[PDB]
Structure 1
Amino acid sequence: ASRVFIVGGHITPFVGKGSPLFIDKKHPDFGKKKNMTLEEILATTVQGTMEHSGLSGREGIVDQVVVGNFLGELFSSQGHLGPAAIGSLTYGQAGSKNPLMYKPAMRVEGAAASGGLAVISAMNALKSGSADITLAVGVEVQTTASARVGGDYLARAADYQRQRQLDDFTFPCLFAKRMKYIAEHNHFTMEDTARVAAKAYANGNKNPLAHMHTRKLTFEQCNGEDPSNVKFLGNETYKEYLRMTDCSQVSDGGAGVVLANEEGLRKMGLSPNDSRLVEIKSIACAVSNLYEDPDDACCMFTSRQAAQKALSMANIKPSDLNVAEVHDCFTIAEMLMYEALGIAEYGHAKDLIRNGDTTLEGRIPVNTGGGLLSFGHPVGATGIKQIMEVYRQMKGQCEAYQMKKIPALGATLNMGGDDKTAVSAVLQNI
């Protein structure tokens, strides 16, 4: 196979309610200035990604662009982000010369796995001989509607005919439903999930890019002792299993990554041992049936398939991983992800979180920058963000949450819907 290299990338701040970067009634610039649009975020992400990757002034050597985005058609009335990305380099500079003109571009989608799917597409282009350098960007804007209205948009990721009726907050409810079963089988507890949140917010507190950077929450708060941490669902059956702090954020943001094969490195004037690089040893996608759910809510069968293929293609095992990024769309999902990735055996994610093994100082740090819970979750961006966080830790770029032991191996696990699409990648430092 042709090898694949992460050359560089960019994560915007992730912003929404609770961030000082978000312009609401509590902001100096309220009334004066607006938050970024989808087009603006896409422009910032594309330009930021080119800059960090050392391509400013030679963007014409990028052969192709893939955008990951889930709901731009709903939140921003805008599809067709392929040609949006082609215009993103020189956005708002009318008539300007554009070195991306006529290149291939498209949007890919699998709910919150859209970013990961974007990386896969780019990687297939690189191994197919139709590209030597690709740009994969993911973006999302979700703050243009309430959390309730957004919850109906996010339900586009579920089997909508079958599952929308559970609750206006369809996804939160689907994970609350997992938690009920999880509790009845004593797989792990609501204490355990509160410990996940405490970790995430503590990690976020060290990350200025994080949506929840300025919010502090104690274990006790996340564990429900605060009455402002409401059990907000409407469905009576599942209401008691989910608190606000268990939920990923409604965020706006972008993440981008430039990927290259060996011929692309050559073109950029780079060697395969260049210390700015990280190798993607493997990536893998697994998709289950939208229309049918397994009974065992304590196992994410699809995410487990993806993680298994990826580590296998990389010829490593979970115990070899030094860092991971997992899809904590809820605290409940982070626990399940530990077991789907394999860093915990079935029923033993509880051990890991009770023992601090996934904190910054633990033996397998996870979601070092705050996860979907604190860093935030602009759905389309998440999958690429995960890649870039492992990259940044590997390159010593994470500042206040930088790991003291630079990780040699990392893994990502990105998930769309209720474990219906999963994408997992193994990353090796250089």
Structure 2
Amino acid sequence: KRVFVVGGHITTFVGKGSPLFIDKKKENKTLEELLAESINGALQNTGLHDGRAALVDKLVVGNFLGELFSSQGHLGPAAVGSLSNSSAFLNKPAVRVEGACASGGLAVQSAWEALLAGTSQIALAVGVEVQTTVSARVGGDYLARAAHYKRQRQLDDFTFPCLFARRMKAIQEAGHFTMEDAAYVAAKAYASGNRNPLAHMHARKVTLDFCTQASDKNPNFLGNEIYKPFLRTTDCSQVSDGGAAVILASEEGLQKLGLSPNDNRLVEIKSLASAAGNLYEDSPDLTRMTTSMVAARTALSMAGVKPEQLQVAEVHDAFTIAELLMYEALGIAEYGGAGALIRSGATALDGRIPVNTGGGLLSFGHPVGATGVKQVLEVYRQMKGQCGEYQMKNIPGIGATLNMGGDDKTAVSMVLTNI
């Protein structure tokens, strides 16, 4: 019973705001291409790039949307397809999973499940998404496929960020953290995105006083004219294309690789949980995310990892406001105080536990289904030294992940131990 990480390549993330945008200056990167980049490079890192593909036992696709973003689904066998002497690989099991945002961690969970079962010996997981297609207010209409469209659409054409735009005021009506605490997040996040080469919002960074209110270039944009002012553009994560694939193996599979559970290139995983809460009912604790807590305190407790021993984390914060409800679930911190221990440097690349060091969903990119997988690779690149530039001298042998689903209606967390 041992789950391993052996590699995985992450693509460049694009969108408006990233000068890597095309507008009838060419034909932008397609979902078929976005997965082409993601997996060919995921293979390449691993000791195989040719007919040595024929050993990948299980394929899992963590796509969330494409039935309208590319008007096309069934991405399982699409992973079988995009290799093209480089097309031989076919007729291997392949599924597609969905969990709104945690579509990536769920995919890894499928291979995770596939691993211990004996279904497969060496598997791959692949996250990807394409939100750069058309209208921005229309895109949120297709993101309400995470919450009750029947009960939560009669709010606005921007109904998705409203769950937090209301939690933005629900928290201001509390003494846990302030609107000003939601400011020190973006600048820090946008800064970390300035360190990452392939970051979506790589070429931007402003003063804290601007990631606060008193702004106009980065304000809200909503329609809920009472919850409208209760968000900023600094809160909305990045509408971003981009893939993020990963290869996984077994101890039994290791023998064929010519490896051993020791190699200075792999990272092991011994704790992995998951959870899902009702979406027909929203949190009575608008000042809490409960589904992530289960996925945390249950996961690592299998490995009994003391959260204060954590060295580097990655979270699926859809929003800065959601980012501040992370460390309450991820037991590395506690409750009753959020926007203080963040300025203890326990979030920064030069401190206790640097979180979202590549920029996170604010500047790294948020390809809904590729955001899930990438974190597992974000704590891999630093635990082995591949992040580059934004590589931390603070070296770990312990990591963690945190995936989000809707309004904390699905959660996936992990423990990455450098065995």
Please indicate the TM-score interval, normalised by the length of the shorter structure. over 0.9
Partner Cα separation in structure 1 for residue 125 and residue 48 of structure 2: 14
Q: Could you list the runs of 5+ residues in structure 1 that have no partner in the other structure?
A: 25-29, 91-95
Is 1:192–1:354's contact at 8 Å kept on the other side of the alignment?
A: no
Report the Cα offset of residue 145 of structure 1: 1.9
- 1:25-424 equivalences under 5 Å are 30-31=24-25, 33-57=26-50, 58-90=52-84, 98-424=87-413
Report the Cα offset of residue 210 of structure 1: 0.7
Partner Cα separation in structure 2 for residue 354 and residue 9 of structure 1: 32
Q: TM-score, normalised to structure 2's length?
A: 0.98
Deviations 1:234-274 (A, max 9, x none): 10231122000111010000001100010111111111100
SS at match of 1:18: coil
Who is 1:18 aligned against?
A: 17
Is 1:65–1:105's contact at 8 Å kept on the other side of the alignment?
A: yes
Partner Cα separation in structure 2 for residue 97 and residue 415 of structure 1: 36
Percent of aligned positions that are identical: 72
Q: Which amino acid aligns with 1:77?
A: S
RMSD: 1.1
- CA distance change for structure 1 residues 77 and 405 in 2, over 3 Å: closer, same or farther? same
Is 2:172–2:178's contact at 8 Å kept on the other side of the alignment?
A: yes
Aligned residues: 418
Deviations 1:282-306 (A, max 9, x none): 1110000010112111110011111
Deviations 1:78-113 (A, max 9, x none): 1000111001122xxxxx663321100010000100
Deviations 1:145-181 (A, max 9, x none): 2221110000101111111122211221111111211
Report the Cα offset of residue 23 of structure 1: 1.5
- CA distance change for structure 1 residues 225 and 400 in 2, over 3 Å: closer, same or farther? farther
Is 1:322–1:364's contact at 8 Å kept on the other side of the alignment?
A: yes
Who is 1:93 aligned against?
A: none
- Bigger helix fraction: 1
SS at match of 1:80: coil
SS at match of 1:131: coil
Q: Which amino acid aligns with 2:179?
A: M
Partner Cα separation in structure 1 for residue 55 and residue 218 of structure 2: 50
Partner Cα separation in structure 1 for residue 165 and residue 300 of structure 2: 30
Report the Cα offset of residue 317 of structure 1: 2.1
| Bigger mean CA offset, 148-157 vs 399-408 | 399-408
SS at match of 2:177: coil
Report the Cα offset of residue 415 of structure 1: 0.7
- CA distance change for structure 1 residues 222 and 97 in 2, over 3 Å: closer, same or farther? closer
Partner Cα separation in structure 2 for residue 120 and residue 185 of structure 1: 36
Is 2:317–2:404's contact at 8 Å kept on the other side of the alignment?
A: no
Q: TM-score, normalised to structure 1's length?
A: 0.95
Partner Cα separation in structure 2 for residue 127 and residue 266 of structure 1: 16
Q: Which amino acid aligns with 2:359?
A: G
Partner Cα separation in structure 2 for residue 241 and residue 128 of structure 1: 47
Partner Cα separation in structure 2 for residue 236 and residue 314 of structure 1: 47
Q: Which amino acid aligns with 2:172?
A: A
Report the Cα offset of residue 356 of structure 1: 2.7
